[PDB]
């Protein structure tokens, strides 16, 4: 059975640093944990897979190489993303009273 | 050419400036397409300019219709009943903005040869010349060679 399609929208959690540091402790602890280099493939995979499973949002292959540090991972997981259609965006962008937008799609 | 084209006189829709200026443009219907390189500029205009234009011109109703189209278009309806349909096909954001602003600033009167660059309803203030102006009057209104 195919699971229902997942929504691409992702709002960063408020307890993002706490969750990320807990996962860092689980995987790898030292001071300045944001600078823990993710050069070991085993640890990189563990951390990123745990984060993806938890948050529902995964690092794309294009950004996987540039996620070199826990700081980079934190940046990627605190930048948000939305998946609403262009119609929804335009209609929710505070359309003036004299501007009517309709989709025949 | 002028002889092969209709012509009109300089005029305003309802004396547009005497009391107050009324923007003649009333409706702007933008037929755009989700897909199709022809309407890329139209899509960018809808995203970045149409809202600003709408709020700048509160007297114009704008209808953005996104349907499958090979030639995106803009239909401008003016108070006088004139409809001007312009293709925004493969026009950049700047070109679309200039075209829309020209439509907004333009009256509904036909774009044909204007016979005179001016129009006065009261051309004369001192009295239109007639042959008897600048002609002196004679005693008892006697025409030349009249005896009595």
UniProtKB/Swiss-Prot annotation, chain A:
Main location: mitochondrion
GO cellular component: cytosol; mitochondrial inner membrane; mitochondrial large ribosomal subunit; mitochondrion
Keyword field: Mitochondrion, Ribonucleoprotein, Ribosomal protein
Keyword Ribosomal protein: yes
Coiled-coil features, chain-numbered ranges: none
GO biological process, one term: mitochondrial translation
Keyword Isomerase found: no
Location in or out of the cell: Mitochondrion
Quaternary structure and partners: Component of the mitochondrial large ribosomal subunit (mt-LSU). Mature mammalian 55S mitochondrial ribosomes consist of a small (28S) and a large (39S) subunit. The 28S small subunit contains a 12S ribosomal RNA (12S mt-rRNA) and 30 different proteins. The 39S large subunit contains a 16S rRNA (16S mt-rRNA), a copy of mitochondrial valine transfer RNA (mt-tRNA(Val)), which plays an integral structural role, and 52 different proteins.
Family named by the database record: Belongs to the mitochondrion-specific ribosomal protein mL50 family.
Protein name, as recorded: Large ribosomal subunit protein mL50
Residues of the full protein shown: 51 to 158 of 158
Swiss-Prot record, chain B:
Location within or outside the cell: Mitochondrion
Gene from which the chain derives: MRPL43
Any one biological process term the GO annotation gives: mitochondrial translation
Keywords linked to the UniProt accession: Mitochondrion, Ribonucleoprotein, Ribosomal protein, Transit peptide
Tissues where the protein occurs: High relative levels in skeletal muscle and testis. Lower levels of expression in the heart, brain, placenta, lung, liver, kidney, pancreas, spleen, thymus, prostate, ovary, small intestine, colon and leukocytes. Expression is coregulated with TWNK.
Family label: Belongs to the mitochondrion-specific ribosomal protein mL43 family.
Assembly behavior: Component of the mitochondrial large ribosomal subunit (mt-LSU). Mature mammalian 55S mitochondrial ribosomes consist of a small (28S) and a large (39S) subunit. The 28S small subunit contains a 12S ribosomal RNA (12S mt-rRNA) and 30 different proteins. The 39S large subunit contains a 16S rRNA (16S mt-rRNA), a copy of mitochondrial valine transfer RNA (mt-tRNA(Val)), which plays an integral structural role, and 52 different proteins.
Species for this entry: Homo sapiens (Human)
Annotated protein name in UniProt: Large ribosomal subunit protein mL43
Lineage per the UniProt record: Eukaryota, Metazoa, Chordata, Craniata, Vertebrata
């Amino acid at each position: 059975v195919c699971p229902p399609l997942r929504s691409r929208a992702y709002t960063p959690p408020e307890d993002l640093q706490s969750r990320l540091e807990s996962y860092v402790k689980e995987v790898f602890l030292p001071s300045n944990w944001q600078d823990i280099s993710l050069e070991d493939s085993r640890l990189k995979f563990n951390l990123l897979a745990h984060l993806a499973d938890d948050l529902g949002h995964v690092v794309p292959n294009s950004r996987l190489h540039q996620m070199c540090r826990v700081r980079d991972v934190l940046d990627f997981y605190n930048v948000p993303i939305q998946d609403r259609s262009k119609f929804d965006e335009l209609s929710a962008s505070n359309l003036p009273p004299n501007l009517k937008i309709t989709w025949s799609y | 050419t002028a002889r092969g084209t209709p012509s009109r006189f300089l005029a305003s829709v309802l004396h547009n400036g005497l009391g107050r200026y009324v923007q003649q443009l009333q409706r702007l219907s933008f037929s755009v397409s989700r897909d199709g390189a022809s309407s890329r500029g139209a899509r960018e205009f809808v995203e970045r300019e149409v809202i600003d234009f709408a709020r700048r011109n509160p007297g114009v109703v704008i209808y953005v219709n996104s349907r499958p189209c090979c030639v995106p278009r803009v239909v401008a309806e003016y108070l006088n009943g004139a409809v001007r349909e312009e293709s925004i096909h493969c026009k950049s954001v700047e070109e679309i903005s200039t075209l829309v602003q020209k439509l907004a600033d333009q009256s509904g009167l036909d774009v044909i040869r204007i016979r005179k660059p001016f129009h006065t309803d009261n051309p004369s203030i001192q009295g239109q010349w007639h042959p008897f102006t600048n002609k002196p009057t004679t005693f008892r209104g006697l025409r030349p060679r009249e005896v009595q």
